[PDB]
Ligand binder design. Structure first.
Ligand SMILES: Nc1nc2c(ncn2[C@@H]2O[C@H](COP(=O)(O)OP(=O)(O)OP(=O)(O)O)[C@@H](O)[C@H]2O)c(=O)[nH]1
Ligand SMILES: Nc1nc2c(ncn2[C@@H]2O[C@H](COP(=O)(O)OP(=O)(O)OP(=O)(O)O)[C@@H](O)[C@H]2O)c(=O)[nH]1
Ligand SMILES: Nc1nc2c(ncn2[C@@H]2O[C@H](COP(=O)(O)OP(=O)(O)O)[C@@H](O)[C@H]2O)c(=O)[nH]1
Lengths: 100, 430, 431, 430
């Protein structure tokens, strides 16, 4: 209503034009409002860590990589344990001996 | 009785002061509100009749943002509101702006509050001035404040923990200009100047703390640990107490030569902690490692003139003597011919406190190595050509002239830095 | 508490300023009715840089609008955020300038300039401390260019020490809208050299190229170009309004950017500009922001930096970042492209970090490049101006508004001198 | 850390890239949408903060249809939209059209996106260039892109999985022409070239998979399996890891001689699967069978120069050593006199994943044998007479000249291919 008669016949002039900072929530660029407004937080260690997400993100990435490597190594080491358990003690020719 | 007044000038000074005062509050048990649930705090805090402790500090800046961040943060009830001093216009990386036009009224009020603070101290060991060589607020206003302090207080020991521009990486363009100006200023005013380089501390954090993305908060935390180790002998008793007055006597060979490399040890994260012994000899060797220098200046190039070692925690004089004997016998470390001893050891029985949320681990032993060595001439040599390279074309000279400076001031600062180079070369030479 | 007085000139300037004020009000959580609805303390902490408190919770922008025709100001008032501005700051004439710099500077601009200065003085005296003025307008238009240059001269006379920042929409190289763009631009650049402390050069064709190639828009109206410009205008002064890990005001940027007083023209760009399709595909890291920032296509100036040499470059980053990461990116860019950076300045980058990114974006970065590449833009404007002035086409209107022909020669000589300075520092050798 | 940038040029490049990326998505569990329900994907995918994974691939083509097929198919939400680069006019099987007139702007944009891709990689093992020697896009634009890559990136290892015309069967007429041109181009740019022939892969599919009507989907699936076996060591750990940089060290004796035969084993449908043991020795023998070669080039005519084996699945060093010893003892397999070992064995613990919709069965063991041998000169000998036979009459030479080429270019390409023939003969001879 506040618009004057001129430039009110066509409101296509005042489009959204929100393509700047139009990053979709599914995109990696998106940052919520609570994430934007943060302080350095000298007094609180939790606040300092919240300011330094990227250091925490790097620590978590390293921890996840090391845990994945550990899981892979444990499974593999079980595999070589099963493979190297095979020897003369195992009854590989027991059936042949029984048949003879 | 052992009061030390802290001054923090500029964004860098105030941001390292935040870490310093967080560390001091955690060390003395003082809560952020101001009060704690003997008399070891008197060095940094003055208690009121209500039991609340207010720090003997002064946060000076010509920009309101940094100081208002402190006024809004957790330590809003700790510091004195008038002790936080805020300007109106920033110095805009201009030494002339921060030294001649804007800095005048601000430094007048700063001296007023500094006098009020010093009137509340029975003794006064000295001033701890934390500024940024390379910014108008830090360089210009800091230089003016140091000059006024020298004029009025006189022989009070001023320890300037300055941050000098890094060799290659930097954040400013007029940084060589105002750095040269401030160095000319403080060559004759500060008693002991400690050099700090953001590049060196970044490398320290990247290698030792395994922080692939180091930041100013981590740098300030490391600097705060260094200063706390330096001042621990004032606050907590121990064998071989070393004082602010003894720093100069045992570290400064001549009045001109008082710039000092600083290095802390150990710098180890919690995950990498308790994997090594961290003995006295090992931490001393780590402190003497050139990579552990908090300044991008390889000491192998120069010769050590004096080395003050501040040990914290479970440290015994036999171990410090063995470590220093091994250091002397090491061929890589070289001392000047005219200084046979060149060592000043001081032990303290208080281990360094750990800031929650920080990366440093709880280590029972710590060393702060502050050394005067002629290697430091390298950084002045870098700034001396970075200055004259721009000065040849007189780039950014009109900016400095506009606020009441002259080309003669630039010439004088450059000549003074050349003379400082010559003095370092002379004292290094036999 | 370091206030900035915003001024809008002409149709293009008024549209850009309206979009800019919409962006800033959105960033500070200000609804079109002026009341604060942001629910964040940092938004209201430094709102006084741009806004003043009304009787209630309403916040009035410290903006002053100029025009010679009332239509554009009617449009600004009728827009979505048209009601925030105080009606008294709308200064309009009655007959517009016919794309005539002479009409906008001497005949019709003279009467309105008294009221314009009255409003500017009224707004500045209310400020506690004044960082300076920012004027958004378009070179190559009558009222915009003329009255903008006249007002910049007047404000320089009144407040010499205060900062003057200009966002001038220089006429585009390939597609020209009006015929007398070379005349108006040549007359206005001469004024900006003498008066404006700091000036960003913006081009509609640079904006079109960036919105076709980076944003990949299909039908970009002028609102989109104005929105890119507004994003740059916000990002320049975000350090004044939000806490920063390494803050930098307008004067600090100008000091670190301007080597010599006459070389104060800059190319600017805003990052991260991502097409809607590739938004999920792009991951925002500081190196990604720097890579997009230093790209020639990201520059909102038509001149590409590859032809010239970067005298200086400031980068204002926004978001939770590593200062080491940022500084390392800047140093790596300098080392890799050392050929494009002036030798007699050891460090050509002024890096600033702000802790509050724009809403929605995890990180952002605005760029201000002072490079000798702008030489080719002024050279092209000269190539058109001299061609038209040799035969004195359309000169009769400018003569009939009462300004001498020698003024054209003086303006052309000054602009050529500026071009010569840029070339000199492009080919200057150390020692 | 081990990122490898994939380039797919032309219809054949993009069509084999479709199979390659389907195989990679199936191998890493990455859904076609882009994200998966560690860091093994980093060799082929770059992950965003949202968790969605985008491949480090570039689909380059002067024709819109092939790229739009990707844009419309299932993998429309996977690939980077701008990384899909489409031309407006096809090269029309003209090397000159794709190398001198149309390819300029396209390759400029390609280098732009390639710089963007490489800037996102900490490490860079190299580039995998998949093009079609025998078409204007693949030959001309591929050669131009390879030249630009060699100019700017420099020492990065470019592995060109090129598809040369088959000896008798072919689909084009100017195929010898642009094939000779592209061979002259890539003799000096690519680090390791892998030879591929449609006739040979058709024979493999018909004889081993019992497919009476093989098609391009089958061919691309086999090629994708070969490339995945080649790159498996980068993404999955195993005994005797092999590297892209180690291919050059262990495979090419001389820079000129870098063309390599490729052979996969086993190629069996599930009907024939679990009818044979499929032991390491048997699959190695199958890999060394000449019918298993993906190039119509009988290795009996020449001598093996080097042989790199990449094993996938349940393979043990004892079995691989037994198989290689048997192969060495075999008289039909002949090695050069100056290379006594000529063997580079590398095992991986990740069995080759089976593509649903493919004809290959799930086999617990697989072998990819890539061999440098002097026999490969035979294919160049065939193209060299197929070329000069047409060139005597200068048929279709006007087409190539019309887009800015010269008879000198054809003459130089023919002379260079003759020099390559001479080099192969020389290295074969004692
Ligand atoms: N080590 C370290 N250095 C810092 C930190 N913050 C700022 N600096 C340095 O301080 C210098 C500038 O500091 P200041 O002069 O206080 O900046 P300012 O407050 O805007 O004042 P002016 O720059 O003079 O206008 C920069 O060059 C930085 O290198 C910090 O947190 N840690
Ligand atoms: N192995 C294999 N080869 C293919 C496939 N598709 C095409 N080719 C070969 O690729 C050659 C031509 O490829 P392109 O150059 O990309 O054809 P285009 O996309 O029309 O581009 P131009 O022909 O150069 O204009 C043909 O001679 C085929 O032999 C495929 O799916 N698998
Ligand atoms: N970016 C942008 N440019 C504009 C807009 N409106 C006009 N322009 C351009 O600005 C140039 C000058 O027009 P302008 O100065 O506003 O006309 P004036 O107000 O009568 O002086 C024209 O050539 C237009 O192409 C706008 O809304 N945004």
């Amino acid at each position: 209503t506040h618009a004057t008669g001129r430039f009110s016949r066509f409101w296509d002039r005042y489009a959204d034009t929100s393509h700047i900072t139009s990053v979709d929530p599914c995109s990696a660029s998106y940052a919520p409002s609570e994430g934007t407004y943060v302080r350095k937080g000298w007094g609180s260690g939790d606040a300092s860590s919240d300011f330094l997400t990227y250091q925490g993100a790097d620590r978590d990435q390293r921890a996840r990589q090391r845990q994945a490597v550990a899981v892979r190594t444990t499974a593999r080491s079980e595999v070589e344990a099963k493979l190297s358990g095979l020897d003369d003690a195992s009854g590989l020719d027991d059936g042949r001996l029984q048949v003879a | 009785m052992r009061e030390v007044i802290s001054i923090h000038i500029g964004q860098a000074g105030i941001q390292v002061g935040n870490a310093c005062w967080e560390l001091y509050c955690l060390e003395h048990g003082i809560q952020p509100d101001g009060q704690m649930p003997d008399d070891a705090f008197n060095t940094f805090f003055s208690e009121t009749g209500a039991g609340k402790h207010v720090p003997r500090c002064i946060f000076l800046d010509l920009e309101p943002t940094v100081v208002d961040e402190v006024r809004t943060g957790t330590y809003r009830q700790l510091f004195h509101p008038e002790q936080l001093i805020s300007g109106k216009e920033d110095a805009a990386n201009n030494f002339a702006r921060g030294h001649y036009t804007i800095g005048k009224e601000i430094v007048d009020l700063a001296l007023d509050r500094i006098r009020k603070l010093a009137d509340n101290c029975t003794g006064l060991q000295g001033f701890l001035v934390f500024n940024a060589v390379g910014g108008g607020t830090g360089s210009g206003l800091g230089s003016l404040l140091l000059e006024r302090l020298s004029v009025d207080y006189g022989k009070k020991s001023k320890l300037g923990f300055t941050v000098y521009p890094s060799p290659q990486v930097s954040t400013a363009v007029v940084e060589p200009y105002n750095s040269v100006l401030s160095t000319h200023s403080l060559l004759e005013h500060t008693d002991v100047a400690v050099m700090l380089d953001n590049e060196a501390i970044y490398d320290i954090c990247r290698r030792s703390l395994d922080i692939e993305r180091p930041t100013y908060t981590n740098l300030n935390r490391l600097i705060a640990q260094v200063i706390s180790s330096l001042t621990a002998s004032l606050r907590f008793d121990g064998a071989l107490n070393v004082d602010i007055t003894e720093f100069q006597t045992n570290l400064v060979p001549y009045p001109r030569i008082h710039f000092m490399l600083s290095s802390y040890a150990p710098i180890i994260s919690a995950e990498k902690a308790y994997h090594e012994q961290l003995s006295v000899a090992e931490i001393t060797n780590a402190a003497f490692e050139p990579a552990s220098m908090m300044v991008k200046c390889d000491p192998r190039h120069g010769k050590y003139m004096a080395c003050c070692l501040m040990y914290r925690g479970d440290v015994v004089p036999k171990d410090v003597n063995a470590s220093v004997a091994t250091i002397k016998t090491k061929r890589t470390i070289q001392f000047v011919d005219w200084c046979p001893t060149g060592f000043k050891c001081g032990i303290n029985y208080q281990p360094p406190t750990v800031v929650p949320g920080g990366d440093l681990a709880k280590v029972q032993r710590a060393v702060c190595m502050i050394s005067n060595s002629t290697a430091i001439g390298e950084i002045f040599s870098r700034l001396d050509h970075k200055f004259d390279l721009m000065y040849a074309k007189r780039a950014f000279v009109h900016w400095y002239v506009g606020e009441g400076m002259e080309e003669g001031e630039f010439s004088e600062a450059r000549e003074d830095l050349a003379a400082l180079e010559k003095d370092f070369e002379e004292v290094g030479a036999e | 508490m370091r206030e900035i007085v915003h001024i809008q000139g002409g149709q293009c300037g008024n549209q850009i300023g309206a979009k800019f004020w919409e962006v800033v009000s959105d960033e500070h959580g200000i609804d079109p009715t002026g009341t604060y609805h942001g629910d964040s303390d940092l938004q209201l902490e430094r709102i006084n840089v741009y806004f003043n408190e009304a009787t209630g919770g309403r916040y009035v922008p410290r903006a002053i609008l100029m025009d010679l025709e009332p239509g554009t100001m009617d449009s600004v008032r009728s827009g979505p955020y048209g009601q925030i501005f105080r009606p008294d700051n709308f200064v309009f004439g009655q007959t517009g300038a016919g794309n005539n710099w002479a009409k906008g500077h001497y005949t019709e601009g003279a009467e309105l300039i008294d009221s314009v200065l009255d409003v500017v003085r009224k707004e500045a005296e209310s400020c506690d401390c004044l960082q300076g003025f920012q004027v958004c307008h378009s070179l190559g238009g009558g009222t915009g260019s003329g009255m903008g240059t006249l007002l910049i001269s007047k404000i320089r006379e009144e407040y010499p020490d205060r900062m003057m920042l200009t966002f001038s929409v220089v006429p585009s190289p390939k597609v020209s809208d009006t015929v007398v763009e070379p005349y108006n631009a040549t007359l206005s650049v001469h004024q900006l050299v003498e008066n404006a402390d700091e000036c960003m050069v913006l081009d509609n064709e640079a904006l079109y190229d960036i919105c076709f190639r980076t944003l990949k828009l299909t039908t970009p109206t002028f609102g989109d170009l104005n929105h890119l410009i507004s994003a740059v205008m916000s990002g320049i002064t975000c350090c004044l309004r939000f806490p920063g890990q390494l803050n930098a005001d307008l004067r600090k940027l100008a000091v670190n950017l301007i080597p010599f007083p006459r070389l104060h023209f800059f190319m600017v760009g805003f990052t991260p500009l991502t097409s809607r399709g590739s938004q999920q595909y792009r991951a925002l890291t500081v190196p990604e922001l720097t890579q997009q920032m230093w790209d020639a296509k990201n520059m909102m100036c038509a001149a590409d930096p590859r032809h010239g040499r970067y005298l200086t470059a400031s980068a204002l980053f926004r978001g939770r970042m590593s200062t080491k990461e940022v500084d390392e990116q800047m140093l790596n860019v300098q080392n890799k492209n050392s050929s494009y950076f002036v030798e007699w300045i050891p460090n050509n980058v002024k890096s600033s970090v702000c802790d509050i990114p724009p809403k929605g974006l995890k990180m952002s970065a605005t760029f201000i490049g002072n490079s000798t590449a702008i030489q080719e833009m002024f050279k092209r404007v000269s190539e058109q101006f001299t061609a038209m002035f040799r035969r004195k086409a359309f000169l009769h209107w400018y003569t009939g508004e009462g300004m001498d022909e020698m003024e054209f020669t003086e303006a052309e000589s000054n602009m050529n001198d500026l071009v010569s300075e840029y070339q000199q520092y492009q080919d200057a050798s150390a020692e």
